[PDB]
């Protein structure tokens, strides 16, 4: 176990160097490829290369392809290693294809379930435990869970974005938490399930680190949806094949909140604008809250209920107004980023991200305290 | 053996239908993505979607992902099935990324060797025969062969192009030849190596058929380099893991000629222009030969030798001229397409491709006649 992990750490560090180096090397290619855009929360109108998650994702694959013989230098764990690499590779591919082509939201949800198929087949051939603990055999519903886990993690990361270094940053906190957890649980009982998880988590961390080097404020590159697809599948891969998917979903606490808080807007029960990202006040330099103003008559009975319950829960800022066109309701954009600006006022982009990363650390500490009996201590 | 092959044929036919249907469905996406271009050998200036090999390649992957449990419903042949799918998937990905980004020719040659790594690792873990028959153990040089085989097949297909339905068409003749060969050799001796090859060749044939449906004259879509990368790796995958790589390289006869005949121009020993494709005479409707005119003084001593030897072999048409700038030499563009126009005069695009496809059939018949003792018959 320490001998292949040493080799895995060496290739991961070479991969960090590789990502840091290749990202600015391909800058010209992405700009020429029209795979670039402006940073909307910035006064600068310069084009920044998009989908850089494709370069770190590619570096990740090559690193692991080289690593493949070392754990071996038994097949049951080897099939899962090649199978997991197929599922991740397919996802980086279909992820980048979705970035380049901008597929319909319905086709976007099918892509993660498509890429997760080899894991389901490996779990089938290697006779994986279809039973779950509250002792219940899910059988077919367990395979539906595995399929949907890839779809969840990607979109959970993808919905909690809009400020520089958030998507890559939250993934670093999550992967580092899994790394810490794997090491703690490596000492005894489940050694095989946590050594396997480390094999993917260490290269994922260091390639993402190299990406964050360029994505961090002030954003030099964008990660793109390719990164969210890549990250989401890597987390689903380790959680599924490591059997710690429940523990792993607890590291997704800020994402789960942000998702449910967003849900009334996403389902269009409460009016949703094109972009729910904060509005930068040029004179301040900091980011202010964004709003979704709409006609009160056009709002549904269910929507009027949810918006009144969320206002009474002290989560949404509601501003009533009346114009020549009629009466309009200015509802606060429902996302964790805008909720932090409601609670703490206007915050600068670099501090706002860092704060959400700290919030991600807090949740991980909460998970760890539950799992290891540290509630009495703290 | 017939039971999983039946299921493989069913999914392959559904895949044909899928490719035929999805290609025109995504037309809008590619045009908007600026992933489109004009057909240079045509008077029509309309933009035709590029890289459609990504859609057939994707359909291929999904088909095989569904197929994975059926041969099983033993691991040694399963590892190669998942391993081969990883190598092919990685290639479709890095292939499409190269289409979208247009990487340097030196990085383009590293991509196939990168994607072929899982096959090398599977061949390593599953203790593959490093020995070869003229009885010689190549050891390390055998792994270099496997790595370079992917690079060869892709580029061999990629260099023999320039007319509608050639790249997809030549791949259909090659894959159909391998299908026929697998079936002949399935009856006895090596059943496992040919049943494995069929598992990939049948889905490759029917997805390419669906692509050719739209690529065939008059080209509605372009296959892109994504297809050449995809095709090349699938042929290298089956040849390597099926151990019939020598027999398979004989089906690549028109490609091997076209490559070597092109070599003096590619290496720039003899001047090479931007495009060595035929020139369409608007009044004729047919395609005429293309030429590479250059200064005789700028031509190397080795280049003057090769061009004189190729002229004496009755392969290249050389036209000497003298202008105000000085004396210039108008050399014929060295490719199998232009050589066919030198021998048979101007030919229409639809007939020219069909003729090269027939030429590909001839070579396959030659290979089959050698392998099965049919020289006396014909």
Numbering used by the authors:
A (entry chain A), B (entry chain A): 7 to 79, 91 to 151, 162 to 405
Authors' text:
The apo WT- and Val264Gly-DPAGT1 proteins gave structures to 3.6 Å and 3.2 Å resolution. In the crystals DPAGT1 is a dimer formed through a crystallographic 2-fold axis, with an 1850 Å2 interaction surface. In solution, DPAGT1 exists predominantly as a dimer, as shown by native mass spectrometry, although the monomer was also detected. WT DPAGT1 has an apparent Km of 4.5 ± 0.8 μM and a kcat of 0.21 ± 0.007 min-1 towards UDP-GlcNAc (STAR Methods); Dol-P displayed an apparent Km of 36.3 ± 7.2 μM and a kcat of 0.20 ± 0.012 min-1. Interestingly, phosphatidylglycerol co-purified with DPAGT1, even when not added to the purification, suggesting a role for phosphatidylglycerol in the stability of DPAGT1. Comparing the WT and Val264Gly structures showed a small (1–1.5 Å) movement at the C-terminal end of TMH4b towards TMH8, which would affect both the dimer interface and the exact position of EL4, which forms the top of the Dol-P lipid-binding site. The entrance to the catalytic site, between TMH4 and TMH9b, is open and accessible from the lipid bilayer via a 10 Å wide cleft.
The first step in dolichol-PP-oligosaccharide production involves the ER integral membrane enzyme dolichyl-phosphate alpha-N-acetyl-glucosaminyl-phosphotransferase (DPAGT1, E.C. 2.7.8.15, also known as GlcNAc-1-P Transferase [GPT]). It catalyzes the transfer of an N-acetyl-D-glucosamine-1-phosphoryl unit (GlcNAc-1-P) from UDP-N-acetyl glucosamine (UDP-GlcNAc) onto dolichyl phosphate (Dol-P) (Heifetz and Elbein, 1977, Lehrman, 1991). The DPAGT1 structure (as reported here and by Yoo et al., 2018) consists of 10 transmembrane helices (TMH1 to 10), with both termini in the ER lumen. The active site is on the cytoplasmic face of the membrane, formed by the 4 cytoplasmic loops between the TMHs.
